[PDB]
Amino acid sequence: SMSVKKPKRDDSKDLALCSMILTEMETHEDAWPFLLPVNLKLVPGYKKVIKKPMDFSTIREKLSSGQYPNLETFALDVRLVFDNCETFNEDDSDIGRAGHNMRKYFEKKWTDTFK
Numbered sequence: 530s531m532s533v534k535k536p537k538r539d540d541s542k543d544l545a546l547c548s549m550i551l552t553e554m555e556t557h558e559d560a561w562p563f564l565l566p567v568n569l570k571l572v573p574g575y576k577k578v579i580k581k582p583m584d585f586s587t588i589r590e591k592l593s594s595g596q597y598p599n600l601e602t603f604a605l606d607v608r609l610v611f612d613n614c615e616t617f618n619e620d621d622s623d624i625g626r627a628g629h630n631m632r633k634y635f636e637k638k639w640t641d642t643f644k
Contacts, residue, residue, distance in 0.1 A: 543600045547592060550638050554607070555585055557634060559627040563610050579617060583609040600643065607635055 554560060566584045569576045588606050590596075597603045614628030 540600070544592075546642055547597070547600055547603045550635070550642060551585065551589060551592060551607075553638060554631065554635060555589070557631060559630050560585065562614065562624045562627050563631065575617065579613050581609060581613075583613060585610070604639060608632070611635075 555564070563585050565586050567575050567579070567582055569582070575582070583606050588603070588610070591606065592603065597606075611628050611632040614624065618625040618628065620626070620629070
């Protein structure tokens with residue numbers, strides 16, 4: 530509350546560490562469905578169904594240009610990418626399975642880096 534603060538967690542390395550995580554996601558072999566925005570002209574249904582499209586290149590641009598106010602907003606966009614994938618792709622599909630794998634990969638790095 531006013532003039533009453535919890536001790537200051539060091540957030541000065543967060544930008545760099547989110548960038549490293551994002552590099553590791555970018556270079557994973559199962560990243561291919563997520564590298565670029567879904568082409569809304571060429572993928573019937575995507576525009577109407579997926580209200581907030583997200584992809585790694587878009588996260589990378591937001592990160593590089595100071596559009597994440599804190600590390601939680603960054604994790605929300607990463608998770609958005611996998612939530613979108615689950616919404617549009619059957620679990621038993623290459624892309625469906627890619628999304629599960631990448632989410633697992635992300636969540637571990639997230640825990641090991643920050644918790």
